[PDB]
């Protein structure tokens, strides 16, 4: 279900979010 898609965006988001962590 969405969970499959959820990990898809979550991986990408993790970078965007991670950038903040780094920033």
DSSP track, 1-23: -HHHHHHHHHHHHHHHHHHHHH-
Q: CA geometry: angle at 22 spanning 18 and 23, to 5°?
A: 110
Q: How far is CA 1 from the centre of its chain?
A: 17
Place of tokens 């499959």: 4
Q: Cβ of 20: how many Cβ atoms within 10 Å?
A: 8
Please tell me the distance from the alpha carbon of residue 23 to that of residue 16, in angstroms, as a whole number. 10
**Distance (Å, whole) CA 18 – CA 11:** 10
Instruction: Report the alpha-carbon distance of residue 16 to residue 6 in Å, rounded.
Output: 15
The experimental technique behind this entry is NMR
* The token pair that represents 15 in the structure block: 């970078």
């Amino acid at each position: 279900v969405f969970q499959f898609l959820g990990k898809i965006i979550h991986h990408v988001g993790n970078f965007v979010h991670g950038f903040s962590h780094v920033f």
